[PDB]
Amino acid sequence: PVEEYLVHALQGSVSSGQAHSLASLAKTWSDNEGVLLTEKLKPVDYEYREEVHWMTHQPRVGRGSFGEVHRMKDKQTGFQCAVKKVRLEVFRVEELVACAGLSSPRIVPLYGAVREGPWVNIFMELLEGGSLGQLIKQMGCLPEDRALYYLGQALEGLEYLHTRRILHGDVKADNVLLSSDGSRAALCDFGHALCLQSLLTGDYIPGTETHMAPEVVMGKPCDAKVDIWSSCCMMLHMLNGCHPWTQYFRGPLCLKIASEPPPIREIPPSCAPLTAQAIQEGLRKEPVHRASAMELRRKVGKALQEVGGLKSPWKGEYKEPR
Ligand SMILES: CN1C=C[C@@](O)(C#Cc2ccnc(-n3nc(C(N)=O)c4cc(F)ccc43)c2)C1=O
């Protein structure tokens, strides 16, 4: 009843506020409005404006697929964090509604969101350890124990999301961000995020093709499990130093995912029995037979123990891809 009036109060201003306010306001985003969820990012006289109240680093780098994430500093508090720019016309509400209010070490925290013209600027914690995606290029591929250690942590994050009926929609090494020392990993980029109970309808944006599940490619309905398929495509990416299918095929990798059997052949034979079996559960074509996050996280935990826990260093010597 009063919801109408609360939305109006938030509009036209940037305020220090709370996740529930941000979600309400964000829904209006299909001149300077927004909510900041942390003390460290303060608006000034109802405003928070690029190059006035917050400065993007003048060296200027570009993280993310579209060079859309940047290092930034709030001019007054001097607090540093990251900003994802989303085009306003493309902006999907779920990216925040999923992300907002979430408290978990396996998820990158949201610090707020502010609209300014054709942009939505989404603020978040800065992780200086880079992406798992960068780690793989850097070190070619990863050792079995490291690989399991991280997949487990990704799976821990997916549990959290699925308990709240949220689908990440694009699980992939690029979207797993590491800490300074590399002991902790967290999921980021909820730009394909959905709420749960068909998939292919209208304003929906699809994930990475190589990491895409069969039910999605074909078009059957989808559940939490589509993330599980991706997470294991990512497992393989960590082990072999390249995405599945790419080594074996050139033209349209989608039709290959549907017709061909799961790419379990890409599991290096030198993996332990359980490591291989865990991945096999995760990549079963049919969601009903495929494992859930809870089931796979448990199996992955076991496989790590089975190879004597996390031995190998965080910056081991480069290993050759397959
Ligand atoms: C909480 N939250 C708010 C917006 C969000 O949906 C995102 C994202 C995203 C997309 C691509 N890339 C990165 N990305 N961020 C960082 C960083 N925080 O330092 C980063 C660092 C890299 F090295 C590479 C990509 C990176 C982050 C989201 O999840």
mmCIF file with all atom_site columns, C-alpha atoms in Angstrom, residues 144 148 272 274-275 278 298-309:
data_model
loop_
_atom_site.group_PDB
_atom_site.id
_atom_site.type_symbol
_atom_site.label_atom_id
_atom_site.label_alt_id
_atom_site.label_comp_id
_atom_site.label_asym_id
_atom_site.label_entity_id
_atom_site.label_seq_id
_atom_site.pdbx_PDB_ins_code
_atom_site.Cartn_x
_atom_site.Cartn_y
_atom_site.Cartn_z
_atom_site.occupancy
_atom_site.B_iso_or_equiv
_atom_site.pdbx_formal_charge
_atom_site.auth_seq_id
_atom_site.auth_comp_id
_atom_site.auth_asym_id
_atom_site.auth_atom_id
_atom_site.pdbx_PDB_model_num
ATOM 1  C CA . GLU A 1 144 ? 44.537 -31.375 -8.713 1.00 0.00 ? 144 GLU A CA 1
ATOM 2  C CA . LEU A 1 148 ? 39.340 -29.191 -5.926 1.00 0.00 ? 148 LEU A CA 1
ATOM 3  C CA . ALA A 1 272 ? 42.414 -39.699 -8.601 1.00 0.00 ? 272 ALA A CA 1
ATOM 4  C CA . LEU A 1 274 ? 37.129 -39.786 -6.765 1.00 0.00 ? 274 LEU A CA 1
ATOM 5  C CA . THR A 1 275 ? 38.205 -36.552 -8.458 1.00 0.00 ? 275 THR A CA 1
ATOM 6  C CA . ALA A 1 278 ? 32.950 -36.275 -8.648 1.00 0.00 ? 278 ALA A CA 1
ATOM 7  C CA . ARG A 1 298 ? 30.552 -33.065 -0.116 1.00 0.00 ? 298 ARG A CA 1
ATOM 8  C CA . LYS A 1 299 ? 32.074 -35.315 -2.774 1.00 0.00 ? 299 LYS A CA 1
ATOM 9  C CA . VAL A 1 300 ? 34.622 -32.666 -3.760 1.00 0.00 ? 300 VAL A CA 1
ATOM 10 C CA . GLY A 1 301 ? 35.623 -32.196 -0.129 1.00 0.00 ? 301 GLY A CA 1
ATOM 11 C CA . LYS A 1 302 ? 36.231 -35.930 0.095  1.00 0.00 ? 302 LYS A CA 1
ATOM 12 C CA . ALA A 1 303 ? 38.310 -36.004 -3.106 1.00 0.00 ? 303 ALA A CA 1
ATOM 13 C CA . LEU A 1 304 ? 40.608 -33.335 -1.692 1.00 0.00 ? 304 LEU A CA 1
ATOM 14 C CA . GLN A 1 305 ? 41.137 -35.329 1.513  1.00 0.00 ? 305 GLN A CA 1
ATOM 15 C CA . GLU A 1 306 ? 41.773 -38.399 -0.666 1.00 0.00 ? 306 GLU A CA 1
ATOM 16 C CA . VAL A 1 307 ? 44.734 -36.685 -2.379 1.00 0.00 ? 307 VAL A CA 1
ATOM 17 C CA . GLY A 1 308 ? 46.178 -35.545 0.960  1.00 0.00 ? 308 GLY A CA 1
ATOM 18 C CA . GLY A 1 309 ? 44.532 -32.142 1.267  1.00 0.00 ? 309 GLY A CA 1
#
